[PDB]
Amino acid sequence: MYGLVNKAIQDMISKHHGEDTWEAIKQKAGLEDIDFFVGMEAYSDDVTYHLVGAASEVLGKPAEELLIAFGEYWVTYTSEEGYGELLASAGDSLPEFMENLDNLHARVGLSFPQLRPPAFECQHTSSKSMELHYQSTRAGLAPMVLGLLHGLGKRFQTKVEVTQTAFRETGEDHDIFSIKYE
Amino acid sequence: MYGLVNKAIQDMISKHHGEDTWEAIKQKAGLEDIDFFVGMEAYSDDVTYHLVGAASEVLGKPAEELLIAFGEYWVTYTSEEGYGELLASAGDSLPEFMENLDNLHARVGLSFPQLRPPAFECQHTSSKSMELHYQSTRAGLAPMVLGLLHGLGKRFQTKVEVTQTAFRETGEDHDIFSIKYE
Amino acid sequence: MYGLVNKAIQDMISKHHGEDTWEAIKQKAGLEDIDFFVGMEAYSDDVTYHLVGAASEVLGKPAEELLIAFGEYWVTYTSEEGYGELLASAGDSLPEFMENLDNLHARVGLSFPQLRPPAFECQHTSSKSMELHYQSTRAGLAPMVLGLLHGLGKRFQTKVEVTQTAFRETGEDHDIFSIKYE
Amino acid sequence: MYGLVNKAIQDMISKHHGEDTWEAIKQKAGLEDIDFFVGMEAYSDDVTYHLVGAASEVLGKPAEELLIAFGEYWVTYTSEEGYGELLASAGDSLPEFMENLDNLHARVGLSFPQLRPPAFECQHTSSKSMELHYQSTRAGLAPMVLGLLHGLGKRFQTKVEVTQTAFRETGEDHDIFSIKYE
Amino acid sequence: MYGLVNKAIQDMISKHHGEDTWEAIKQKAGLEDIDFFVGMEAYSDDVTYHLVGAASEVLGKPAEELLIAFGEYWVTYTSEEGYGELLASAGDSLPEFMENLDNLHARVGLSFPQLRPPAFECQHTSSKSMELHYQSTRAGLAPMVLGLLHGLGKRFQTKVEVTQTAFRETGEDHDIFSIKYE
Amino acid sequence: MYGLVNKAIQDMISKHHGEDTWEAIKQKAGLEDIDFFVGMEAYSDDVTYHLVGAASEVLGKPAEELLIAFGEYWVTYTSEEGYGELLASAGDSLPEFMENLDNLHARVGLSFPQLRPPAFECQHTSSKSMELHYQSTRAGLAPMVLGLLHGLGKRFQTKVEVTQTAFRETGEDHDIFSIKYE
């Protein structure tokens, strides 16, 4: 993934746990060489999976829980580190934002040539609920999606209950979530 | 037009008149189905013309006057809902901004693939006046242009006197305006 | 419009009437300064209108009649002068091509930054007809659209009868054409 | 997927089995409403899957076997229907072409705003082999990738033996193919 | 260069020296005709070199020193006149920002079609130093680069010692700088 | 530079001198590691310079003389290897083509994200001459520009005499060529 993703992980870990901790995860993940992540450069995805794996081992939390915290954090990180207006433009409520998410990432991708964005399709089941289809070239990120959705609930002051009902990891076509909001 | 246009109309009407009023216009325009406008999605232009037509009937104001208020509002709405830096970059005075307006919309259009922007050509007649040519794929929006120009005068603390001297609605090639400023 | 349009007019007139006629037309249009048109450079629309009025004068043909000739010509010109794959990609039947026309001009628009390309909306009224809405920032080019549709007919080996039912020139919102096709 | 993919299936099936068979397949897929596919318009992925399942049913062939046929076909189709220079530009040998494949789809992606194109990573294990990582937002298209590689073999006049070693469908992170080539 | 560059020069001179002074430089540079620079329009580069030359003569400072002040100012000007989020996104420290600078300008260039950005390559010689290669289509701007680097040191609260060790002006391939930081 | 440039050199040398000579050159350049060039991948400029110095050594020809040969070759190569329509689109005469050259590279630059393409400015000094300003982030490629102009002469069936009057290498701001053409 692009370096910004790995910077955001470093940032969350640094700020929640301090540098020493960050350095220990970084060392563990096999990454002590790298002096700093370059935000607009492409990195092999293993970099990210190794960080989360190392953070899990070093912090004594499951991987899923780090990916959940990271997803939530990302909503704050993008808004504060150069993408605040882009976020704002993608809408004003949870239901709208999720409909715009493919278009948001298409705009990201204008600037990040090599982006491999997720794809999100909403089927609204009521004015307060939907079924969300999450399609990705990557494996293993559903818990980051749950995190992101809660981050978005906070951003819109909207309570969000989310349950995953299909699992790309067991060989289903893709992840699917039922969501109720406000 | 893109959904953001219709959100901005909903916003202006909601904030100036309350929700109930907004809902009544929305119902009248034939649009009660739509739970929310999706900002980065393309809508049929009739959506917008129907809203203005319904707002006219429900508020008891002429259509032109709504389109005038809307034009002015739009200068505030874009600056506050995700396009504040883009607006800033298009310049620092009325004369400059209008020269940049085609380039501004070309930048908008990078992100809105399907954009059909207006085209604006300035002929400066003095360092305090110009003749503005407004060319559009759409009919009926000259009063939104007058609105926008006054919104831009406010933004630059510049007094703006604008008169329309050619009328695309009577079959002239396009709308033209004489403008004096400061 | 971009210089490719002006080159096409020069080429058409030259081919059909010889160079002496072309030079006369160019001179009458007030354009003898211009040594050659630069294909990817933007020109004032006025350049094209002057060429067409001057050609009308010099040839004894109405301008509208020349614009029909020019519209058919453009389909061949574009296919032979650098856009043949782009054209092929837009479809292999009349109705399909007309549906892809905005997307064709969007692809043109990636290469011509300053493009102001017409917008075309199809309402298919059966498998052998459609209503075509032509929306344009410019005036006076509906007869070219008639010639283009005929060029496309020949391209597909499809007979097509085009009849205009609404006229921008007279103050209607946009040109609308009723199209029967085999 | 974009309509060009669906056109290609229709063309392949038509060419190989005639129109009556094609119309039967299209009808069985629940698509008799659709008068023709619009090449540059986005369709629900479901349209393509339904066509392939309906073709499998109507022809007595497994869907996977049709997707291989379709993958080989696409290499010829794209080269003949508007993408021949683009294809040529991506290389003049199998390994080179496979290395340029993301960059080829990035160029496709400039023209198809909403493209969701596969990601392909090569690990060259010698001058006569590589391991190919196929990563996709979509399920079920690994057999098409097998057919495409064979089409590319013919394009280069290179024999190629493709054997899949990892399977998304069964829950593995992504499809991985082992490729020997002359 | 694009008009924004010349606006930024006018701004720095105006704010540091007042308008009268600005007007005198502007007059001297042969530019009194131009009522205002259009930020997103392309200008001949001589415009910029003439301004700096005139400012040098009128202010009684060497050209290099103006270009140094301008470079530093530019880091503030972009951050405040519409590019603050873009700047933020290009990173969080001197070493990272300089690695992202080509990507930053590639993003600028999406919006400025005709941009001729510099190219910057970093060779890191320690976690506190590098060798920076500055490649440009233009001559004469090395002192603006030194200015920019100090502006970036301020932005990141990082002390920066920079020495130029190759000179494109004497016919070396390009400018090179040794840099130590913090 | 992007791998297409290196492929072109390999192709030229191979075609003209056979493979054994090519392999010798590649080995002498220190590049025997590289199994093949990837057309759409960016390479360090050094790769190209090393190939040219190594070819000069192995063939007994000055590097400048090879770069002329390479410049003529590129006009044919690009027209035959995927860019023939793009080339055709840039004009049908020498002067027109030279005026469109920046716009041609802008279109190339949409496909090659990281392109650093030369800038070319024409001052037409009559209908049979121009002064050509070649501005480049890179050193040493003026003799290639001489070969390209000759390739373009042949393309148009236009004799052309190119004589360089200003030299970057010696410290002048940029290369300037005086061009007479039939």
Ligand code: HEM
């Ligand atoms: C303006 C804010 C955002 C920016 C700048 C941004 C940008 C990015 C970037 C650069 C990547 C890495 C993909 C790659 O390197 O190829 C990414 C991945 C991802 N994004 Fe966003 N994005 C933003 C908002 C969000 C939000 C709010 C969501 C929540 C729904 C989201 C969902 C995801 C997911 C789930 C991934 C993981 C990659 C995958 O699934 O394949 N994005 N995005």
Ligand code: HEM
């Ligand atoms: C950064 C601020 C702006 C943004 C994001 C923006 C974006 C838009 C969008 C999305 C549309 C709808 C067109 C379509 O959907 O195809 C539009 C239309 C329009 N814009 Fe802007 N624009 C902005 C600034 C302005 C300003 C300040 C003016 C005032 C001169 C202006 C003049 C217009 C007009 C008159 C239309 C009506 C459509 C037509 O004439 O065909 N724009 N713009």
Ligand code: HEM
């Ligand atoms: C690959 C083929 C084509 C290319 C490269 C091309 C490119 C262009 C260009 C450069 C313009 C000038 C617009 C401007 O300068 O702002 C133009 C205008 C135009 N195009 Fe196309 N185009 C193509 C095919 C067609 C076809 C087949 C049609 C038929 C419907 C068409 C309809 C028009 C019309 C009516 C205009 C006039 C401008 C206007 O109405 O405002 N185009 N196109």
Ligand code: HEM
């Ligand atoms: C110039 C040639 C090509 C063009 C114009 C083309 C264009 C496209 C398009 C439009 C899609 C549909 C994606 C979407 O709608 O979101 C697609 C998908 C696909 N392409 Fe290509 N492509 C080309 C060559 C190839 C080749 C040679 C391969 C062989 C490796 C390939 C691999 C695939 C695969 C496997 C997909 C399936 C979608 C997926 O896996 O998610 N493409 N491409």
Ligand code: HEM
């Ligand atoms: C978001 C902030 C920035 C923006 C909007 C911006 C944009 C620009 C623009 C429009 C030009 C004129 C080039 C042309 O007109 O063709 C330029 C030139 C230049 N930029 Fe930036 N840039 C920014 C940041 C910087 C920074 C921080 C540096 C410092 C390393 C930098 C280094 C340069 C240099 C040295 C030039 C001179 C032109 C040349 O060398 O050929 N840029 N940039």
Ligand code: HEM
């Ligand atoms: C369709 C035809 C062409 C294509 C696809 C093409 C593409 C390219 C590419 C990829 C580069 C490498 C730049 C980089 O990697 O950053 C390049 C450089 C170059 N191009 Fe072109 N180009 C074409 C035609 C021409 C022509 C006819 C000329 C003749 C004036 C020309 C002048 C040059 C020069 C002098 C460079 C050397 C790089 C430099 O000077 O910095 N190009 N072009």
